[PDB]
Symmetry: C5
Subunit: 116 residues, 5 copies
């Protein structure tokens, strides 16, 4: 697997506006929410020692909280359909957070594309 | 188990006003106290390596200290009756700290409801 | 053992003014000095992987450096006679740092008391 | 191996301007981009438990994010040809980040040179 | 072994002005450079998992970067002759960083002396 795999998906020029941390199945997790200037919203969660993307938890939490603090427009890389516990998906999202990037414009950000 | 389980409980729109850290039974712990603008108060502790909520100790420590620093209104997810050692409950609380969220309003905060 | 055991002791409303880190017997340690006002000094050190209170080293380091930075009056929970290497005690203290609390006044602080009955 | 080995290479007086984090093959990684005074770019990636430079991931991540925050002109030490997965190299770089230093000038920086020797 | 051992040595009232991090022999390390009021210079490196002082790497990195950020005058505790790889020593120093202290004056700092007899 790779953050820059030709898959869904990414949202660019996102300001991280909301932050939530919790626990499920003996694993700490965090979720972020971001809004583009056009009003489009994206939610993505990361879990410690989880499925495929668990190894990134520590780095993503640090980066996400950093980006929440500065308020800078960033790129959210996500993989849909990862989290499957229905009440979790309902209240939050099925999206796993798979990467983060700084942006130069609302569409142009550092690093790989993640798109079909 | 999950932060968003249909149980007690959560306080929304809380400013974290007090912070305590210590050790019991070879386990580090921290407790927070927070006030809602109505002056209503909530206490919760997180303890490393404890039974159910111990896994999220360091994540919650980092996040609670972050929120204490910013002074922003947040949501405290707790579970009552977790700590049972009487002098500990008397001095602090039985409530385990179970999650944290940023809030858009005094009652509306990011993530799941923890509601019985 | 517990931070809030009815034992010696605690110093409430302390501004942490001094900070030191070193190593002894393959173990990193930090130590703090602060004044009440009042005016009296308290010193306490925490040591990684130390016998009784080693579990709290990482948390207390983080919290102590935070409180040193803000300058806010805080409570120092300590256990006397923990550190025993005589030059260490002479230059620093025998006091182990066993907990920290935020304070509302110079004596009223969040969390348990640590005092003898 | 050593950061100060007589090899390619180093860029001095670099301001870290871009930051990216991700995962590949079950390993977290971060990448940085920086600009020198004239606008010339250098990219370098650090990857946890990777090749020979994997041990430095945590320190480099902390230090690079620190310098990104301050906007200090810094020395980027790098080793080309380390990352070999083609889409990764194409999107980012083959350069591994192998060191960081503060700088007193745009060209004078603390610590060793990472430089090929010249021929007499 | 201890930071406050009667050995070489210490520089008091230094401002940490330069910071370097890298890797040698699969070990992450960092080095600092500090200047005293008079202009006198001191360099010291801390290396993860290396020699007797390796256990302090994380604490010392955290504390040195903190002190570099504040720019406050501090005490560098060091041990000369620890690093032996000639190109490393030439480009940086043989001195291992063994401890750090806040200072009240240019000579008076918190904690032990590290002085020869
Ligand atoms: C510029 C750019 O950006 N590009 C493009 C263009 O091209 C041109 C050429 C030049 N180049 N330079 N660089 O074109 C245009 C038309 O006019 C367009 O197409 C563009 O693109 C863009 O767009 C935008 C708006 O529409 C958007 O879409 C973008 O994308 C994204 C981002 O943001 O980035 C991508 C993707 O991934 C996403 N997602 C999906 O698809 C699913 O997941 C999208 C969306 O959806 C989101 O964001 C929400 O809104 O988008 C682009 O880039
Ligand atoms: C969120 C909100 O706002 N909700 C509600 C409403 O609904 C609407 C819908 C939603 N969505 N939107 N979009 O409605 C209204 C009228 O009807 C109201 O009711 C609201 O509610 C509220 O209220 C209040 C009072 O009355 C309160 O309750 C709140 O919250 C809480 C918080 O804080 O969060 C919830 C609960 O959970 C809690 N807790 C408990 O129960 C314990 O465990 C509460 C209280 O009690 C506390 O806080 C104390 O103070 O609250 C709500 O929400
Ligand atoms: C010192 C100096 O500066 N060096 C040199 C000189 O020398 C002088 C004498 C000795 N003594 N003192 N100390 O010389 C000159 C002529 O003759 C020259 O060569 C110099 O060099 C320089 O140059 C420049 C040009 O622009 C540059 O190159 C510099 O730097 C660098 C940095 O940045 O650091 C170095 C190197 O390493 C690099 N890299 C490479 O090569 C590969 O990697 C370079 C470049 O390329 C970059 O940066 C881009 O821009 O550069 C030098 O130093
Ligand atoms: C207190 C003090 O400071 N000391 C002294 C004095 O006092 C005496 C009395 C008793 N004590 N009190 N308690 O006196 C004076 C006049 O005589 C003097 O001597 C002093 O001393 C000082 O001096 C200075 C100049 O010379 C210096 O030396 C100082 O310090 C040091 C530091 O910095 O810390 C010390 C030592 O350790 C060092 N090092 C060595 O030796 C080797 O490592 C020194 C030097 O060398 C350096 O720094 C260079 O710069 O110094 C003293 O303290």
């Amino acid at each position: 697997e790779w953050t820059g795999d030709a898959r869904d998906g990414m949202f660019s020029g996102v300001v991280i506006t909301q932050f939530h941390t919790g626990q499920i199945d003996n694993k700490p997790y965090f979720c972020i929410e971001g809004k583009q200037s056009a009003g489009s919203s994206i939610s993505a969660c990361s879990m410690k020692n989880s499925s495929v993307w668990g190894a990134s938890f520590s780095t993503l939490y640090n980066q996400a909280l950093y980006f929440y603090t500065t308020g800078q427009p960033v790129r959210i890389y996500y993989e849909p359909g990862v989290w499957t516990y229905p009440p979790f998906v309902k209240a939050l999202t099925s999206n796993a957070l798979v990467g983060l990037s700084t942006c130069t414009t609302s569409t142009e950000c550092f690093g790989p594309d993640r798109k079909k």
